Amino acid sequence: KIEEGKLVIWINGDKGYNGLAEVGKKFEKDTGIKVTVEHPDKLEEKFPQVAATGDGPDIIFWAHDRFGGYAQSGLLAEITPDKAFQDKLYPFTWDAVRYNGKLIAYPIAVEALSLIYNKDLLPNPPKTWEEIPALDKELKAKGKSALMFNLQEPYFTWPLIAADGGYAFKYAKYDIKDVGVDNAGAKAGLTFLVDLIKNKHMNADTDYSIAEAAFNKGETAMTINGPWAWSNIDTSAVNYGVTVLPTFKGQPSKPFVGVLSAGINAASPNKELAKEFLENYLLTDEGLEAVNKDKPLGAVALKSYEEELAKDPRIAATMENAQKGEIMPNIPQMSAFWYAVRTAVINAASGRQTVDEALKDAQTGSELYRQSLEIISRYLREQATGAADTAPMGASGATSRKALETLRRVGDGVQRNHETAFQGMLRKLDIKNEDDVKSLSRVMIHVFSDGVTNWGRIVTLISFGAFVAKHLKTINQESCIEPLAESITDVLVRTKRDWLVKQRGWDGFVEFFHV
Ligand SMILES: Cc1c(-c2c(-c3ccc(F)cc3)sc3ncnc(O[C@H](Cc4ccccc4OCc4cnccn4)C(=O)O)c23)ccc(OCCN2CCN(C)CC2)c1Cl
Ligand SMILES: OC[C@H]1O[C@H](O[C@H]2[C@H](O)[C@@H](O)[C@@H](O)O[C@@H]2CO)[C@H](O)[C@@H](O)[C@@H]1O
Ligand SMILES: [Cl-]
Q: Give me the DSSP letters along 432-458.
A: -SHHHHHHHHHHHHHHHHHS--SHHHH
Cβ(460) – ligand 1 distance below 6 Å = yes
- For CA atoms 115, 237, 39, 105, give the dihedral sign: negative
Print the SS3 string covering 283-323: CCHHHHHHHHHHCCCCEECEHHHHHHHCCCHHHHHHHHHHH
In terms of C-beta distances under 8 Å and separation of at least 24 residues, what long-range contacts does 171-174 make, across chains too?
A: 171/326, 171/329, 174/329, 174/331
User: Reported resolution in A?
Assistant: 2.0
Q: Cα angle vertex 397, ends 396, 400, to 5°?
A: 95
d(CA 407, CA 224): 47
Residue 222, classed as helix, strand or coil, is: strand
Q: What is the dihedral of CA 410, 413, 419, 425, to 10 degrees?
A: -10
Ligand 2 in reach of 422 Cβ (< 6 A) = no
Q: Which amino acid belongs to residue 398?
A: A
Q: Which long-range contacts (CB under 8 A, 24 or more apart) does 427-436 make?
A: 431/468, 431/471, 431/472, 431/475, 431/477, 432/475, 432/477, 433/477, 433/480, 434/477, 434/479, 434/480, 434/483
Handedness of CA 201, 257, 373, 179 (dihedral sign): negative
What is the CA(457)–ligand 1 centre distance, in A? 8
Query: Which residue, by CA, sits nearest to atom 40 of ligand 1?
Result: 447
The residue nearest atom 9 of ligand 2, judged by CA position, is: 63
Tell me which DSSP letter residue 250 carries.
T
- Identify which of 236, 294, 255, 253 has the alpha carbon closest to the alpha carbon of residue 118: 236
Nearest CA to ligand 1 atom 11: 444
Burial class (CB in 10 A: 0-12, 13-18, 19+), 97: buried
Q: Give the ligand whose atoms come closest to the C-alpha of residue 456.
A: 1
Q: Strand 98-99 and strand 299-300: pairing?
A: unpaired
Asked if 412 and 455 touch (Cβ cutoff 8 Å), the reply is: no
d(CA 421, CA 11): 48
Ligand 1, atom 43: closest residue by C-alpha? 421
Identity of the residue numbered 6: K
CB-CB contact of 103 with 94 (8 Å): yes
**201 DSSP 8-state letter:** S
Q: Which residues contact 172 (CB under 8 A, 6 or more apart)?
A: none
To test the pocket of ligand 1, the residue of 447, 455, 484 to mutate (highest count of ligand atoms within 8 Å of its CB) is: 447
Neighbours of ion ligand 3 (CB under 5 A): 198, 351
What are the residues facing 38 on neighbouring strands? 10
Contact 267, 52 (CB under 8 A): no
Domain at 114-256, CATH homologous superfamily: Periplasmic binding protein-like II (3.40.190.10)
β-bridge pairing 106-111 and 256-264: antiparallel
Residue type, 109: A
Does the domain at 335-513 match CATH 1.10.437.10? Answer given as yes
Report yes or no: 90 and 303 within 8 Å, Cβ to Cβ: yes
Alpha-carbon gap, residue 29 to 46, rounded angstroms: 30
- How many whole angstroms separate alpha carbon 190 and alpha carbon 348? 8
Give the closest ligand to the alpha carbon of residue 352: 3
Q: CA angle 140-146-152, nearest 5°?
A: 120
Q: Is the CB of 306 under 6 A from ligand 2?
A: no
- Are 481 and 469 within 8 A, CB to CB? yes
The CA 460 to ligand 1 mean position distance, Å, reads 7
Pairing of strands 114-118, 220-225: antiparallel
Q: How far apart are the C-alpha atoms of 378 and 380, rounded to whole Å? A: 6
CA dihedral 222, 228, 234, 238 (to 10 degrees): -10
Measured between alpha carbons, how far is 9 from 35 in angstroms, rounded to an integer? 7
**CB contact at 8 A, 367 and 359:** no
Nearest to 451 by CA among 485, 499, 383, 380: 499
Question: d(Cα 334, Cα 138) in Å, to the nearest integer?
Answer: 40
How far is 382 from 107, CA to CA, in rounded Å?
43
Report which of 59, 68, 71 is spatially closest to residue 96, judged by C-alpha positions: 68
Residue 311: CB atoms within 10 A of its CB come to 8
Cα-based torsion angle of the residue sequence 426, 429, 433, 436 in order, rounded to the nearest 10 degrees: -130
- SS in 3 state form for 466-500? HHHHHHHHHCCCHHHHHHHHHHHHHHHHHHCHHHH
C-alpha closest to that of 461 among 450, 472, 448: 448
Ligand 1 neighbourhood includes 424 CB (under 6 angstroms) = yes
> How does 376-402 read in b/e, with b if 16+ C-beta sit within 10 Å?
bbbbbbbbbeeeeeeeebeebeebbbb
Q: Are 70 and 48 in contact (CB under 8 A)?
A: yes
* Burial class, 187, CB count within 10 angstroms (exposed 0-12 / middle 13-18 / buried 19+): buried
- Which method was used? X-ray
Question: Is 313 exposed, middle or buried (CB count within 10 Å of its CB: 0-12, 13-18, 19+)?
Answer: exposed
